[PDB]
Amino acid sequence: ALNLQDKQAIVAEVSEVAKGALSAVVADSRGVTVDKMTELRKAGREAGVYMRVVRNTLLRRAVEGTPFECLKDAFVGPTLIAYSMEHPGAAARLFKEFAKANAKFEVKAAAFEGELIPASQIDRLATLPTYEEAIARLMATMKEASAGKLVRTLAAVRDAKEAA
Amino acid sequence: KMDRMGANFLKVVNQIKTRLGANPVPLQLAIGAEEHFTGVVDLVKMKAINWNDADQGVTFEYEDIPADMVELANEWHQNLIESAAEASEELMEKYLGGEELTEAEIKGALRQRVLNNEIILVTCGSAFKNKGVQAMLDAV
Amino acid sequence: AKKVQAYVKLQVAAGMANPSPPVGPALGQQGVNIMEFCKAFNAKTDSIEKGLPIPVVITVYADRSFTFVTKTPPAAVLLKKAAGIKSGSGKPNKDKVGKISRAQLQEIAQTKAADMTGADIEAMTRSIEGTARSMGLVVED
Amino acid sequence: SRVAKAPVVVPAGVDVKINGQVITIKGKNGELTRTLNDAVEVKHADNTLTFGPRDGYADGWAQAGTARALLNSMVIGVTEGFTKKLQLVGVGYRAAVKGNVINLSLGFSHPVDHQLPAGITAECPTQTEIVLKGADKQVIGQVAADLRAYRRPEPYKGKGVRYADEVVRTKEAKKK
RNA sequence: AGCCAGGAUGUUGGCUUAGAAGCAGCCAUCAUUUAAAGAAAGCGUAAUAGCUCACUGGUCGAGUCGGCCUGCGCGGAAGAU
């Protein structure tokens, strides 16, 4: 009388970790191979990432029973889910390894603070996802206007003044 | 036996090169197969020969030209010259230089390669329908 | 296209490899040279030792030339050797014929390093744990 | 059970003539097929025809599934067209199309001439390949079957006239 | 159920055997990134190789499958004017 627990439990386990996840990446991949998944799962667990194939039945039911950060609602076709629990960037970086090799049009979206990012836009954000180098570039635009432009200008003008 | 169906000369030539391990030189080129095997091309003059009964094979100069063969006939005629070229450094040099050469020199150069056991000239003709046997002897 | 094919599977005793059962028909057919191969083959296999059963996978270049990757000696072979026993039983482990230390299993795990599916050398060791059992070695601590 | 209930979806205004048992499909490409179906009701509907049994008959619900299949088949007929491929295998077998009559050297004493029925034509890319085009799915494969009846593929070396691609598992001769 | 896709790694497990190789035979009958793949259910160069397999995820969008009790039918069912 519906005694199978596997589908009732495994939704719950995925919902806990996918709520806990920092950045995650949602891709489509009928035409997979064992090799390409195995090496990517291998490095992923160093970086604090799992990359999973899970039922879409399971993911829709997971969105139904709790509000979801990493989705709005589930996507048609097969779905792979890369998700990261430690370094926030990491889930998307594995897609940028994988895209060089087998298939690169697989990604439907990725989620960043729960907003959905489409396939074209994610390709810029995921290329540099490390905050310290990002803080340095946000500072570099303000720092050029604040103090750099004055000092650089007077050095170029003192070189003109003592050359005449 | 080129009168027989399923016959095509060029594969047999390739089979000798591949399996047996000497270079064939097609010292003829065919005209047709099955029924259509009713003449031959002589690369040496680039003329072509016909038989009716036995007695048209008596007629033995300009009998026809090779007609609409010509594109195939060119590369094989180059391979004929190419083969006579490699029999010494001197003939090879004349070829590289940009000069042309004769049928008599073709026979002399080729004959050294046949005689030494280097190069195996391939000829063709169905015996049963009395095609090309006399041509075959001329090459011998 | 080019006369190239990759990852063709071969198993031959390390650094001595000349005759037609070791080289097959494929080296002859793909234009590959046995003598020249033997010189290349001694050059990655000396360090891990000659005369060992070697896995080797060959990738072929249409210049009549060769490259080879070795996936190191097989773990089954290496465990059998590290526990010293000559050959397993026809009822192995159930009616056993020898013994292996765990310190011996870990030594295999380092030789097969990156070519083991497990998570870490404890997981990997657990993979060759079942191979070592299969060949009839009784596991001493 | 399922596909007694897959209800056509008529593409691009096909000509549908309903006589209450007889249906005739007319168009351009796949023009003028017909079928006569008794124990079934077919309503024309919104280009999305309805198939069921006439009066809830036990033996009539099989033939409702059949009606559907022939109707979907004629739709494929006017859209796409049908089974092209015959081809001839191994030494000396060759064939020339001559109007609507196909002459084949299939190694008989007399090279055989096979002439086609009304809805269907063929032509050959080269003499060892034969491509058939025609209106009705049953008629086209019947012509493929009736040609394939001159030489069944003989399994030692596969020689014969071959419909579609694969036809035989093949076996060795002397073997062991 | 069909349709698409995956269908692995230690590893050609151990032994036996010319070969023994998932798939002649015997013994283990497990482990491993796994979402998953039996040290293998059937074919296959008898076996290297190759093909399918349960098992896994889509398309798919509803009932579905295996047993049993029991009426009735079927084939098994070929002779002498």
Side-chain angles (χ1 to χ4, degrees):
Chain A
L2 189 50
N3 289 87
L4 294 171
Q5 176 60 241
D6 76 297
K7 66 195 221 173
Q8 333 292 340
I10 208 161
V11 176
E13 173 62 0
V14 168
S15 302
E16 197 150 294
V17 302
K19 195 67 173 181
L22 304 177
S23 315
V25 184
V26 198
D28 187 302
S29 203
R30 56 165 74 165
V32 68
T33 61
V34 196
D35 292 88
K36 299 303 179 188
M37 184 50 63
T38 297
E39 299 178 299
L40 188 81
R41 205 122 66 184
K42 182 210 293 284
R45 74 204 178 89
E46 178 178 286
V49 197
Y50 256 100
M51 168 53 132
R52 275 183 170 169
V53 169
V54 291
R55 292 207 71 167
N56 283 292
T57 68
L58 177 169
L59 280 182
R60 301 149 194 169
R61 215 73 178 73
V63 179
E64 200 181 15
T66 46
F68 248 48
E69 181 181 353
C70 291
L71 277 169
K72 187 172 184 180
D73 191 1
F75 306 141
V76 306
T79 304
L80 277 65
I81 180 59
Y83 68 96
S84 186
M85 307 295 290
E86 188 175 282
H87 163 39
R93 314 191 72 207
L94 271 56
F95 196 77
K96 294 279 277 172
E97 299 185 67
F98 190 18
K100 302 183 173 183
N102 192 78
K104 64 205 297 181
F105 301 115
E106 300 210 308
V107 68
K108 293 194 174 88
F112 177 57
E113 307 189 68
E115 187 167 64
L116 300 172
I117 312 298
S120 296
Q121 283 64 48
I122 190 60
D123 187 57
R124 296 291 190 167
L125 184 66
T127 295
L128 293 171
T130 313
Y131 198 38
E132 307 307 298
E133 294 163 63
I135 296 162
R137 289 274 293 154
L138 292 163
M139 189 187 190
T141 56
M142 193 182 180
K143 177 165 61 173
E144 199 260 354
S146 300
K149 183 75 164 186
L150 188 65
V151 306
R152 295 166 181 159
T153 297
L154 301 172
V157 170
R158 186 180 170 205
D159 181 61
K161 181 62 70 67
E162 285 279 63
Chain B
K1 314 213 191 188
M2 314 223 299
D3 58 303
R4 181 174 168 171
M5 293 191 196
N8 281 119
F9 179 16
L10 305 175
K11 70 91 57 58
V12 186
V13 170
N14 199 45
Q15 301 323 275
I16 298 161
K17 183 187 296 180
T18 45
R19 309 178 189 194
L20 301 182
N23 176 51
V25 182
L27 171 59
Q28 292 175 260
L29 189 70
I31 296 176
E34 53 199 60
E35 278 66 61
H36 315 299
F37 191 64
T38 194
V40 301
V41 193
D42 170 75
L43 287 191
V44 187
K45 297 289 182 168
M46 201 66 96
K47 76 183 181 66
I49 315 174
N50 39 52
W51 283 261
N52 291 357
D53 203 299
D55 300 306
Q56 177 65 5
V58 185
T59 305
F60 226 69
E61 194 175 70
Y62 290 108
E63 315 88 293
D64 203 4
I65 62 166
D68 54 285
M69 295 294 139
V70 56
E71 60 182 66
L72 296 91
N74 296 332
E75 70 177 75
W76 274 298
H77 197 94
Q78 192 205 54
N79 194 347
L80 185 69
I81 302 295
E82 187 185 354
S83 186
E86 303 166 305
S88 187
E89 53 267 51
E90 305 187 3
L91 289 154
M92 195 159 55
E93 180 78 62
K94 193 169 193 67
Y95 170 48
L96 187 48
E99 304 204 308
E100 307 185 307
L101 196 54
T102 63
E103 48 271 75
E105 202 57 51
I106 287 164
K107 295 180 174 216
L110 286 176
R111 191 181 198 252
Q112 308 313 296
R113 301 191 78 173
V114 189
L115 264 42
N116 279 283
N117 294 263
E118 313 291 349
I119 240 69
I120 176 172
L121 321 182
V122 187
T123 59
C124 51
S126 292
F128 189 51
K129 297 300 180 184
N130 314 307
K131 302 294 177 276
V133 192
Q134 300 77 59
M136 182 224 82
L137 284 179
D138 178 68
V140 177
Chain C
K2 299 192 185 298
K3 294 280 190 174
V4 299
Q5 191 168 111
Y7 293 97
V8 182
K9 173 187 174 185
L10 186 71
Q11 181 175 114
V12 286
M16 313 88 178
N18 300 288
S20 303
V23 304
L27 291 205
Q29 198 291 125
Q30 296 183 124
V32 207
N33 193 297
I34 72 296
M35 303 179 291
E36 314 302 64
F37 197 100
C38 188
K39 289 179 183 289
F41 197 40
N42 278 252
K44 292 184 182 291
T45 62
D46 192 79
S47 54
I48 31 176
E49 303 170 68
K50 302 185 301 302
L52 299 188
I54 243 296
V56 41
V57 305
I58 56 172
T59 297
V60 182
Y61 303 131
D63 282 60
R64 296 198 173 201
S65 193
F66 43 81
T67 197
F68 75 100
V69 173
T70 61
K71 199 211 72 181
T72 61
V77 177
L78 292 162
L79 290 159
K80 194 165 69 191
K81 185 72 278 308
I85 72 170
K86 296 184 180 295
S87 67
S89 187
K91 295 174 287 291
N93 202 250
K94 205 283 289 174
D95 278 301
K96 69 278 196 297
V97 279
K99 186 182 289 292
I100 196 162
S101 185
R102 295 286 291 182
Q104 295 174 328
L105 300 183
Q106 66 179 98
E107 212 67 58
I108 285 76
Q110 63 171 250
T111 299
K112 297 299 298 189
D115 303 292
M116 311 179 89
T117 172
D120 78 302
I121 66 96
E122 202 166 64
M124 298 163 176
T125 298
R126 186 164 64 233
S127 315
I128 56 178
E129 171 187 295
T131 304
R133 183 182 67 240
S134 218
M135 61 179 65
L137 292 162
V138 188
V139 189
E140 203 62 63
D141 304 302
Chain D
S1 185
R2 260 61 63 184
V3 298
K5 309 181 290 181
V8 193
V9 190
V10 179
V14 192
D15 194 3
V16 186
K17 183 64 173 68
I18 187 67
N19 213 122
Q21 64 310 103
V22 176
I23 310 184
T24 310
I25 267 55
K26 180 176 186 179
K28 56 89 65 177
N29 187 40
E31 53 285 285
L32 298 171
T33 310
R34 173 180 276 208
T35 188
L36 190 160
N37 318 129
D38 187 59
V40 294
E41 298 170 357
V42 189
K43 312 188 178 183
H44 183 85
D46 303 297
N47 298 303
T48 309
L49 290 62
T50 290
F51 300 110
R54 199 165 295 209
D55 300 292
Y57 297 164
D59 305 275
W61 174 222
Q63 182 169 120
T66 326
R68 185 284 304 149
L70 303 180
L71 273 284
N72 291 189
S73 189
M74 297 154 194
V75 164
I76 292 187
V78 307
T79 302
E80 193 174 5
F82 291 126
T83 190
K84 299 269 183 171
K85 195 60 62 180
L86 263 69
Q87 69 196 296
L88 291 78
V89 184
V91 307
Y93 278 177
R94 57 90 186 278
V97 189
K98 175 63 174 176
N100 59 86
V101 190
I102 310 168
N103 191 238
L104 308 90
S105 298
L106 284 175
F108 297 121
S109 186
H110 45 276
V112 281
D113 59 285
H114 186 72
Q115 58 82 200
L116 292 173
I120 180 173
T121 50
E123 42 275 302
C124 56
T126 187
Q127 293 184 337
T128 53
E129 289 195 66
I130 315 298
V131 163
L132 282 140
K133 67 191 188 301
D136 180 52
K137 196 176 177 181
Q138 200 264 257
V139 163
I140 189 159
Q142 188 58 208
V143 159
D146 197 296
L147 283 164
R148 170 258 182 171
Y150 290 116
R151 296 287 190 184
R152 301 181 72 195
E154 201 69 72
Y156 300 107
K157 205 189 299 183
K159 185 166 185 178
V161 51
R162 187 174 294 209
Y163 70 158
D165 294 70
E166 183 61 300
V167 73
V168 78
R169 306 204 311 169
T170 307
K171 63 186 181 184
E172 187 49 75
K174 298 306 303 174
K175 207 183 77 176
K176 54 178 182 187

